[PDB]
Scaffold this active site. Structure first.
Site, PDB file in Angstrom:
ATOM      1  N   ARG D 212       0.812  -1.186   0.000  1.00 14.24           N
ATOM      2  CA  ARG D 212       0.000   0.000   0.000  1.00 14.24           C
ATOM      3  C   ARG D 212       0.871   1.274   0.000  1.00 14.24           C
ATOM      4  NH1 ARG D 212      -1.687   3.698  -0.305  1.00 14.24           N
ATOM      5  NH2 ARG D 212      -3.829   4.538  -0.431  1.00 14.24           N
ATOM      6  N   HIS D 239     -12.985   2.681   7.681  1.00 19.75           N
ATOM      7  CA  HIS D 239     -13.146   1.911   6.467  1.00 19.75           C
ATOM      8  C   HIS D 239     -11.783   1.826   5.784  1.00 19.75           C
ATOM      9  CE1 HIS D 239     -14.531   1.391   2.147  1.00 19.75           C
ATOM     10  NE2 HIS D 239     -14.886   0.280   2.773  1.00 19.75           N
ATOM     11  N   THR D 337     -11.756  -4.449  -4.780  1.00 14.29           N
ATOM     12  CA  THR D 337     -11.564  -5.804  -4.228  1.00 14.29           C
ATOM     13  C   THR D 337     -12.277  -5.938  -2.894  1.00 14.29           C
ATOM     14  OG1 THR D 337      -9.413  -5.790  -5.189  1.00 14.29           O
ATOM     15  CG2 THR D 337      -9.787  -7.435  -3.464  1.00 14.29           C
ATOM     16  N   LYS D 425     -24.821 -11.848 -15.810  1.00 12.88           N
ATOM     17  CA  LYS D 425     -25.671 -11.449 -16.916  1.00 12.88           C
ATOM     18  C   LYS D 425     -25.379 -12.294 -18.159  1.00 12.88           C
ATOM     19  CE  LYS D 425     -28.123  -7.032 -17.377  1.00 12.88           C
ATOM     20  NZ  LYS D 425     -28.813  -6.309 -18.484  1.00 12.88           N
ATOM     21  N   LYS D 511     -26.625   1.106 -13.429  1.00 10.01           N
ATOM     22  CA  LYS D 511     -26.951  -0.300 -13.149  1.00 10.01           C
ATOM     23  C   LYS D 511     -28.411  -0.704 -13.450  1.00 10.01           C
ATOM     24  CE  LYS D 511     -23.403  -0.690  -9.589  1.00 10.01           C
ATOM     25  NZ  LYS D 511     -23.024  -1.231  -8.256  1.00 10.01           N
TER      26      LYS D 511
END
Lengths: 416, 419, 417, 528
Positions: D212, D239, D337, D425, D511
């Site tokens: 990171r 978070h 991810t 889909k 979406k």
């Protein structure tokens, strides 16, 4: 007759003028900048490279009885070899880089050049085409330091015939009659349906230089502020408006393709003093959106040199970007574009008769046509369309009718 | 055999006139051509263009040519260049007289060239008439800087309007053509080495070459055509005249000061945003070690040059520093001829060494008398065949009066051992 | 056992080569890598990156490895670092010859390392060919600052284009790996202790540590990566070579002056807006008490250092004040080896004080012969095991030839009696 | 073998503990005096202050008797002192649980029960709550307030806590962090839900954090701005996106100023009154950045760089902003991810990827379609005490199946362009592409979406189009089938027949609801 030239035409070979120019403005360190890559060449660099390249082409065995070519997209090193040719008075044919194999073979067969400079990007297509032409004895890459699987590049080539002590200040461009030696055979697909390759004398060039230099017509801008070149180098309009930038030493920035935005980005970010574009980029200028979302307050001068529609898109842009009245072309030719705009120096014009063929005087109709040194010396290997284009004594029939606008108004208005 | 730099600008072949003409025509758009720092009078390039042409046709129709000689006697004055350039168009030779000569001196002067016609100033006119009453060959005077004639003395305006009308167009006029190397442009008088009033002869070529040097971006002043240079050195004298005249082919707004006195020089360079100056060493020393010459804002100053008796004793370094300039370069030996050659050899100028015991033509790093050969060199003295063969020798070499040595092929410049 | 400051940047474990490599790759974007203050020539970081990588593979394919030793004889020159860094990738040792040797001296030098390949300058080539005509072992010379070959002499460009081609990508090149403490990086010859030609050996470790120091923000030049530092000190010599080399891992625009002499130093420091200079004491005196050296605008200068026998009491103070600088602090210890250790005890450097007579370790504030131990120290002399064991003793301590003491635990710095 | 590798790293990852590099940072950039600033309060901590506190807290935690086999948590809003405890955990190698501060009692307990931490760190604000909650959890033995000098009603604060164990003369420069393998030691245990629909706690390694940092150091990718210049932090620390982008500001020594919550235009003010160089934000304030008025009434001329690391509104908000704010180019990534976001943006150092078969699962080649998956150390390592989610998320050997499908540009161009953003889909009777092969590859006149899949016949799965026109232009079902009968050949078209309707379907900016259009296909297969 048309305007008296302000800067007397340079007598000698255009090679010699360009040479001298490069030598003078060697001090300029930002000769050409690739707007995309950000690669940059200095004048001093073009100078050395072109001289080296001239002695090279010579010792390798080339002269005026040959023809060389270059096939490359708009690219920094292009002028190295071009200019080198001009020193030696070898003719240069410029190929459009995007021909289909089909079209291209057609082209090269016009001039039939024994050596071919080209771009990295264009090299495969050239090898592919060269395997169909016995005469194309050598290809050279212009924008590489290393050779590309056996294909030689200008560096290696030059270091074969020139050494550590080479000094371009000590080089001399070959001397010849600049009016009877061919500079360029640029092929053109305008009239009829044949390809036909047009011949450009050196004189046409030094006269085009006169025009770039003149402060009422050509771009009157500081010999060290940045002008943008966008027009295709292989093509007559783009090659000459570009090439004329050197006798006056301007930092050129240059874009590969006219398309999209980025024209904007580019023109803002380098502080572009003057641009010279064809009319599509004029419409994009006039009636296109969010084109004042970039700061274009850099723009002193605008030019157009192809097929310019009405004075209204012209005013749309003159106004949008606060310009000194964008004024430009009307009549431009297959040859060196632009003559008689807002007659030109070294260009004379007449109005004769639809019927007789005798020259009229003022306020009298008849077919308007041109005479100039700057005009094409004819076509190549085609005696047909040569004697077809320019008539019995150097007048080039335009195909319109109109009249002499009098002594006190020696300008052009035409009736049909 | 030291050759000296390869020209970056090819010398204009034709008449020096023609080039100047062409220059004026090109830069007609420039409107602040010359400014009289004192009066605030201003002439535009396009005005000089017209005036010089009208005056050319005037002189012609008036009946003069190469076989005559004209003169001009004026202090540094905007209209000076009016008649001068016109002469150069027609190839009439121009003798320049210094305005502060004594009657004694002046008569001597004019007797060299013996000019039939004399332009003059307005404040110099009394003296000119006073003198003309001693010289039978001087048939006419003309005033250059007046609109009205002066008790019978004609002025340039009246004179020109005699032979040209309102619809006259300088765009349609042509300067005479001739061989620019065998036509005398100027007869500038100087009393050197002996002290005798002898008059120097300058070819047109000498000028067109001097223009080449000025255009040159390593030597001559490289600054934007339409920014302001100050020329102050006296116009009747070669240094001031050639440095001044050369400003035209490159189109610079000139401001001009009549006399080098004290400040005001400071005042002006500030007040006009002067980019470059070209001065003699007196105002150089005044620049360096005179105080509060940083009390005026002189931060406009891009380039500085000096071209006479350059005080090598580092006054030059002191000024270069004081005014944060790209290092002042200049001097390196000039002449009676067109000043300045071989600065920081110059194009079309070569120098040699030979030796003062035989006279050979010495090679690298070797002493012997240093002297110059150039097209730009003086074509001699005038009706004096004597000092001509004395100044320049058998084949175009002009003895300068020092010994030095050729600083090798690899350093093609000049260092000299004793002066 | 005075240990000296805890390092702020942990020393890079691997080969010094690999570190310089990564450095070049990272700061490739820098376009003003090195500038020849004289000529105005400029190389970019990415150019050095490519030139050095190509040169590395070249040297390898040409048949060289660690068992040879290469040389460079050049004055202070943009291209100097080209070959040098390439060696460091390959772990071939580099002998640096001072460019101003006499044929006499120079040969004496060259006979220490006995190098088979020699890079050199345009300027140094006459003298070098002249010298190679006396040494059987000197099989090849290559010029570093030319694009074309010089009467039969090959140049780096040509040499490199023999073994690598147009599609070569240095991002895909990898520097040879080895233990950076047993691989020799450099053989710098030095005339210390005796007038005899002895060649000093520098391990990679010593370099990776020297990089540790330049990155450290209390000691080494603490300025933003993309501000302009001046290198003037001789590259062929250790002080100059290392102060210079350490600049890349921190990515500083280097301007470089060939020679210290004159006001040209002043000019330069003005015209390039120079943030830091690092000088030896002669231009220190020229600095403090030379006239009209404020006649140039030197307001660009954040930091000043000195590293060649520093004691100029109080000339240092005269300049600290003259040039509105954060007080110039420096020197206080320099050697045959990587100059500068203990400045104003440094990381990875321990110093002790012992007894002139017994040689047993003292405690705080007590006299006796002071000496150092460090990985950064010379790994010894070259073909001379005599003076190896003479310089550093039985267990890694290297005797300076001074006495003094511990400024206590609570002040672990050095004053010497 | 056929793998896309990913950009050579410009800074080699730091071998050792994440705590160790974080220590060495705080120590080097100790001199910075503006380490973190409460853009709200104006309170400020320095770097060497944090260096101290965190080392103190480290030795306190060790003498108190905690080690790897424990788990400490922290519940707090965005607050200056967050990093003291956090970093000390990282020093000691104790795993840390970041809890969201605005969980409800219910949620929070499910969370805490994953990691089962014994020590909880907390903020003044969060204390009542955490206490309430601890009166359910017997396993949670001690609380500690982090941003208060005095203890609260018996609740020991960080200072009293640290002082028990260190004295006046404690020196951090003498403290060493504990040493271990950075890859086997958990660093963080940040819980995330949504997927499947349960509380599950993600496992981040130390190496994930070193990597990171490697990215943040990257001068083409991570924010390349000068150490000791002011960057804004604003994404919630509890978070992963916000925590790591904030935590990584330290190895480069940046003057952080930080706002607690994203809302409104306090933002403009701050980024002005602090002369803020770079920012890194989520797409909410991206769209507010581009399309919101008079945000050019505060001066944002200090703005060198902008990043964006969440669900990127690649509509045209990115360009609009890069333009408005005249910034060098906001260019971000793709992957999400859920662990350490951003892998493959405009592959990333130490990240690799491959595409596989929809069916086999062997590595494909260039310009070959199939599911995208990554494998990197930087990836989540698994879930905490759950052997079920782990073997699901990543496969046999570390590859993370994105569920998207694409291909990689070229080996001489290692870029991942990807055709159809999900797998669930586009089904057919021998797979067929949906929302991007066609759909966007056909628009005359522009006819706005439609790719769903009708279950009939029992011989396969009917494709079908749900076309909608705008300026009243008449197209037929039969008409469209033949325009795109030669656009793809085989058999594709729409089987049933181009149905025509009003709009497209819902979902947040883009979406579709796929089954929406299938059911909307139903009722419209009946009329003229």
């Amino acid at each position: 007759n048309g305007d008296r030239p302000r800067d007397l035409v340079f007598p000698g070979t255009a090679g010699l003028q360009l040479y001298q120019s490069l030598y003078k403005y060697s001090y300029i360190t930002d000769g050409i900048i690739d707007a995309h890559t950000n690669e940059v060449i200095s004048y001093a660099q073009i100078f050395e490279t072109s001289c080296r390249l001239a002695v090279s082409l010579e010792k390798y065995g080339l002269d005026h009885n040959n023809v060389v070519a270059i096939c490359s997209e708009n690219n920094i090193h292009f002028f190295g070899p071009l200019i080198a040719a001009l020193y030696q008075g070898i003719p240069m044919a410029t190929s459009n880089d995007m021909y289909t194999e089909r079209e291209m073979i057609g082209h090269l067969n016009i001039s039939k050049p024994c050596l071919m400079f080209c771009s990295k990007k264009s090299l495969p297509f050239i090898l592919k085409v060269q395997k169909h032409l016995d005469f194309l004895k050598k290809v050279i890459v212009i924008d590489s330091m290393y050779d590309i699987n056996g294909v030689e590049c200008v560096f290696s080539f030059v270091s074969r015939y020139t050494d550590h002590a080479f000094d371009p200040v000590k080089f001399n461009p070959k001397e010849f009659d600049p009016l009877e030696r061919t500079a360029l055979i640029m092929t053109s697909s305008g009239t009829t349906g044949l390809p036909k390759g047009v011949v450009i004398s050196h004189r046409s060039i030094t006269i085009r230089f006169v025009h770039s230099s003149d402060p009422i017509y050509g771009t009157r801008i500081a010999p060290d502020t940045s002008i943008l070149a966008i027009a295709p180098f292989h093509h007559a309009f783009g090659l000459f408006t570009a090439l004329a930038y050197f006798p006056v030493g301007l930092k050129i920035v240059m874009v590969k393709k006219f398309e999209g935005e980025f024209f904007l980005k580019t023109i803002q970010n380098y502080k572009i003093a003057s641009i010279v574009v064809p009319p599509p980029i004029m419409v994009y200028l006039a009636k296109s959106p969010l084109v004042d979302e970039y700061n274009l307050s850099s723009l002193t001068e605008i030019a157009c040199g192809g097929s310019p529609l009405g004075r209204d898109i012209a005013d749309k842009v003159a106004k949008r970007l606060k310009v000194h009245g964008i004024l430009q072309g009307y009549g431009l030719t297959e040859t060196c574009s632009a003559l008689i705009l807002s007659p030109m120096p070294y260009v004379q014009v007449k109005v004769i008769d639809i019927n007789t063929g005798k020259a009229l005087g003022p306020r009298e109709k008849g077919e308007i046509c041109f005479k100039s040194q700057m005009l094409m010396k004819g076509y190549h290997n085609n005696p047909q369309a040569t004697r077809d284009a320019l008539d019995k004594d150097g007048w080039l029939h335009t195909g319109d009718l109109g009249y002499y606008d009098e002594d006190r108004f020696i300008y052009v208005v035409d009736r049909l």
